[PDB]
Amino acid sequence: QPQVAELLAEARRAFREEFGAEPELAVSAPGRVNLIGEHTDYNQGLVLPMALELMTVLVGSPRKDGLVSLLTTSEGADEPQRLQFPLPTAQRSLEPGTPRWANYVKGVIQYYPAAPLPGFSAVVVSSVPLGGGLSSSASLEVATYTFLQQLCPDSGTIAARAQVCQQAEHSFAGMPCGIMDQFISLMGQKGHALLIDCRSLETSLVPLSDPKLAVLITNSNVRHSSEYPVRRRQCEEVARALGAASLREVQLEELEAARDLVSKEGFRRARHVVGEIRRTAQAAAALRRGDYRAFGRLMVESHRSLRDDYEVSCPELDQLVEAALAVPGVYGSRMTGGGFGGCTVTLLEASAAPHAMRHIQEHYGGTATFYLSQAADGAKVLCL
Amino acid sequence: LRQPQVAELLAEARRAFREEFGAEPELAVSAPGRVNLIGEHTDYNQGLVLPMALELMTVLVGSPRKDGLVSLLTTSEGADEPQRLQFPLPTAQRSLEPGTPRWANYVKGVIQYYPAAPLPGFSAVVVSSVPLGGGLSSSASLEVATYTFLQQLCPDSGTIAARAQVCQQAEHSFAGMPCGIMDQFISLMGQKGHALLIDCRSLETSLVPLSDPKLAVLITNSNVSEYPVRRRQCEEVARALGAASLREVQLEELEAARDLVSKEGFRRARHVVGEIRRTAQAAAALRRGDYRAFGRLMVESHRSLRDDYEVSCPELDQLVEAALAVPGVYGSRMTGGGFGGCTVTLLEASAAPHAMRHIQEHYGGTATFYLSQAADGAKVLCL
Ligand SMILES: Nc1ncnc2c1ncn2[C@@H]1O[C@H](COP(=O)(O)OP(=O)(O)O)[C@@H](O)[C@H]1O
Ligand SMILES: Nc1ncnc2c1ncn2[C@@H]1O[C@H](COP(=O)(O)OP(=O)(O)O)[C@@H](O)[C@H]1O
Ligand SMILES: OC[C@H]1O[C@@H](O)[C@H](O)[C@@H](O)[C@H]1O
Numbered sequence: 001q002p003q004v005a006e007l008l009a010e011a012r013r014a015f016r017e018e019f020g021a022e023p024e025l026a027v028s029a030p031g032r033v034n035l036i037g038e039h040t041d042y043n044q045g046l047v048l049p050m051a052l053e054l055m056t057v058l059v060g061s062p063r064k065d066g067l068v069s070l071l072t073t074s075e076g077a078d079e080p081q082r083l084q085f086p087l088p089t090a091q092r093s094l095e096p097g098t099p100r101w102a103n104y105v106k107g108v109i110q111y112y113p114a115a116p117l118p119g120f121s122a123v124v125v126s127s128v129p130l131g132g133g134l135s136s137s138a139s140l141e142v143a144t145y146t147f148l149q150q151l152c153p154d155s156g157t158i159a160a161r162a163q164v165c166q167q168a169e170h171s172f173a174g175m176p177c178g179i180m181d182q183f184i185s186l187m188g189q190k191g192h193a194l195l196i197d198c199r200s201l202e203t204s205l206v207p208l209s210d211p212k213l214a215v216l217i218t219n220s221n222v223r224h225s226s227e228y229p230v231r232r233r234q235c236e237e238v239a240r241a242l243g244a245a246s247l248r249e250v251q252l253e254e255l256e257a258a259r260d261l262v263s264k265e266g267f268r269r270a271r272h273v274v275g276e277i278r279r280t281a282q283a284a285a286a287l288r289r290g291d292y293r294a295f296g297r298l299m300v301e302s303h304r305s306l307r308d309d310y311e312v313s314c315p316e317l318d319q320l321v322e323a324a325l326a327v328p329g330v331y332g333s334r335m336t337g338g339g340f341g342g343c344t345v346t347l348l349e350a351s352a353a354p355h356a357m358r359h360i361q362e363h364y365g366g367t368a369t370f371y372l373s374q375a376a377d378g379a380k381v382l383c384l
Numbered sequence: 385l386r387q388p389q390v391a392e393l394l395a396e397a398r399r400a401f402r403e404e405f406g407a408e409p410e411l412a413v414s415a416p417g418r419v420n421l422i423g424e425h426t427d428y429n430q431g432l433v434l435p436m437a438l439e440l441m442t443v444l445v446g447s448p449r450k451d452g453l454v455s456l457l458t459t460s461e462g463a464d465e466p467q468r469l470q471f472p473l474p475t476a477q478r479s480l481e482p483g484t485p486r487w488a489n490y491v492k493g494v495i496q497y498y499p500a501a502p503l504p505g506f507s508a509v510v511v512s513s514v515p516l517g518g519g520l521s522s523s524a525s526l527e528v529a530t531y532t533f534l535q536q537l538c539p540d541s542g543t544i545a546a547r548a549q550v551c552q553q554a555e556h557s558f559a560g561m562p563c564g565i566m567d568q569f570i571s572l573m574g575q576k577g578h579a580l581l582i583d584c585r586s587l588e589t590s591l592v593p594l595s596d597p598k599l600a601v602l603i604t605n606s607n608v609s610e611y612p613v614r615r616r617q618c619e620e621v622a623r624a625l626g627a628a629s630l631r632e633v634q635l636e637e638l639e640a641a642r643d644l645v646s647k648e649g650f651r652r653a654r655h656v657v658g659e660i661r662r663t664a665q666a667a668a669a670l671r672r673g674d675y676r677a678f679g680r681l682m683v684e685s686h687r688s689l690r691d692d693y694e695v696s697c698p699e700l701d702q703l704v705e706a707a708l709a710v711p712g713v714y715g716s717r718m719t720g721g722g723f724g725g726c727t728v729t730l731l732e733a734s735a736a737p738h739a740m741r742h743i744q745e746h747y748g749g750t751a752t753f754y755l756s757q758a759a760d761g762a763k764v765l766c767l
């Protein structure tokens with residue numbers, strides 16, 4: 001996978017060809033994979049993501065124009081890959097429009113809490129596959145936010161940055177996500193997974209640094225997204241039915257006692273959340289002591305839960321997981337992200353990765369892409 | 385009440401570097417000081433600590449040299465004279481040695497133990513808003529700033545923890561101060577708006593949010609060793625009880641071994657076992673926002689540090705008592721090694737102005753105040 005220096009150079013060449021000068025500021029923000037703890041973040045639960053070596057790099061310079069001039073080199077983006085617009089004012093504010101990819105940067109600008117924000121020129125380069133479930137969106141948003149910090153440093157907390165980037169995805173991209181993706185992109189540490197408590201936003205670094213251990217990401221290359229807001233609504237319905245603020249304050253037994261207060265579908269939805277939250281806490285402890293096969297088994301429980309109770313999996317994802325579990329050296333595997341496509345995360349012995357890639361691909365009714373990634377750092381400034 | 389900003393420090397550091405070396409510095413770096421909310425003298429006992437990084441800071445600017453020489457200048461007034469120094473890099477033949485001035489030992493030690501090569505010569509000026517000798521770990525601030533600087537000359541491979549241990553080894557061998565890992569760890573690991581619960585046995589770390597406009601952290605500098613003796617006693621008591629460190633001992637088991645240790649040694653161990661338990665309790669109190677409970681654990685810590693560990697002094701005890709009389713104050717205690725230094729006070733934000741007035745008026749000396757938030761750890765500054 002491409003490294004920051006190679007990407008930074010690509011962004012510099014493109015900025016030169018496009019604007020005639022060298023960029024003055026450089027910034028990067030990684031993608032992410034969730035090892036376990038799915039569909040718990042908007043339930044104030046626990047998550048265990050790690051930052052990927054896949055990355056977004058932004059280079060640029062301030063302008064006197066009050067204008068924003070943007071260029072992205074990613075081919076999978078909505079055309080046109082270039083866009084320019086004036087800075088928002090108290091009079092007129094930015095508006096979500098076309099091209100779609102620029103809405104992510106527009107939103108971060110609109111909700112940035114510091115002033116005065118100058119105009120700027122910038123080019124975007126990325127090794128994060130757009131729409132593949134590794135949070136290219138969050139990578140883009142956090143990169144933009146980190147870039148704006150160079151033009152106009154902010155005062156508030158890191159959590160505010162995550163919430164600023166999340167607000168943008170809500171209002172300008174129309175996707176009501178949780179804080180997880182933005183948070184891991186901001187808070188990742190290389191050679192570590194990040195156990196995130198989405199109620200208190202307290203953070204715990206769980207070491208992930210074993211040359212014998214590999215994390216295999218498999219993209220199903222499918223994306224069937226309209227049920228995510230439906231699941232979010234169901235969980236809230238069950239929390240009200242039980243007189244609770246969120247499903248995090250609910251454990252299985254209390255859910256069992258109140259079975260008749262919620263719908264049958266609602267009960268299965270809540271059962272995943274309550275069970276995933278505990279599975280996540282168990283996986284963090286298992287990972288601290290190096291119990292990889294225990295962690296792998298918790299990964300498979302998560303997948304079963306996501307497949308049957310939460311119903312956000314799909315045949316492609318299910319087929320990928322089973323093939324992965326047939327390969328020797330695999331500790332566990334499951335879908336990651338929202339579901340209905342996207343990627344599969346697999347914990348396995350590093351030596352088994354080549355064979356795992358061959359076996360998974362051969363038993364998959366479709367084209368599969370693979371990324372072998374280590375735990376990486378979060379957003380950072382790059383000195384040019 | 386006083387606190388310089390990063391840009392002001394960076395600008396001050398370049399002016400000094402320009403006046404001294406004739407060119408603009410090429411590299412810039414920063415590393416914060418620290419205040420320990422609770423968990424004192426437990427770190428080298430494999431215990432728990434709850435520090436936060438301060439807005440008080442060391443900024444280092446410099447550039448590589450072709451000389452193979454190191455040229456240093458610090459503008460800190462409390463620094464050992466002379467504040468200018470030049471010396472050659474360590475070689476396979478001759479290695480650096482702790483000499484004079486004392487302050488140069490901190491950078492020399494980090495240089496000697498830096499794990500990467502080849503290290504070029506460099507010029508650098510140090511500026512700092514951390515009071516030297518005030519208990520906010522200016523030493524660790526200087527070391528971590530240095531380490532981050534050398535990473536610019538020659539990036540390292542290892543982990544952040546490895547960087548902390550290099551800076552800790554430097555303080556041991558070149559400063560003659562057998563400290564624990566806490567100060568180096570927080571200077572590298574701090575995150576703004578967060579305290580760091582550090583398990584000094586396993587090095588597990590938790591970022592605990594500290595971001596409440598209703599809550600203020602008041603640091604009081606009294607403006608005023610025995611440390612290696614305390615570390616020795618703890619080791620003396622741990623072997624006597626057949627344990628690797630005081631962390632594996634609970635209060636009741638220590639009472640059984642009363643005849644196995646000296647009277648002083650028993651009191652030392654009683655503090656550690658109780659401080660470790662208080663630190664874990666204070667972190668839990670913080671998660672639920674129970675500031676009153678957190679303040680009480682802070683005051684118990686001071687009592688323990690004053691009576692059993694005896695690392696406080698009359699000035700600190702006077703500052704702590706005055707602070708506890710102020711309404712809105714949750715608790716107060718000494719921080720750092722002791723025998724002087726600063727006092728940390730958790731209080732209602734609205735009470736800060738009165739607390740500073742009350743403490744100052746009832747203190748037999750001139751006191752300095754810092755109203756600080758949890759700050760970020762070491763970072764590179766792009767010039
Ligand atoms: N580097 C980039 N350049 C331009 N647009 C981007 C970039 N990264 C993401 N986007 C926009 O965000 C989208 C990613 O949306 P999403 O479905 O959340 O995928 P992911 O799971 O990768 O975040 C793409 O449709 C794209 O338009
Ligand atoms: N920025 C600086 N410039 C010069 N000397 C410094 C600087 N920071 C620390 N020192 C030196 O480091 C020492 C700090 O020692 P220490 O007793 O640990 O105090 P603290 O509690 O502030 O770390 C001082 O004795 C002083 O010589
Ligand atoms: O575990 C499901 C996750 O799905 C992601 O796509 C979403 O952005 C996150 O907020 C989280 O809900």
Ligand SMILES: OC[C@H]1O[C@@H](O)[C@H](O)[C@@H](O)[C@H]1O
Pocket residue numbers: 420423424425426427428563564565566567720721
């Ligand atoms: O709480 C006592 C502390 O004292 C400091 O001076 C020391 O550097 C730290 O490592 C820690 O032991």
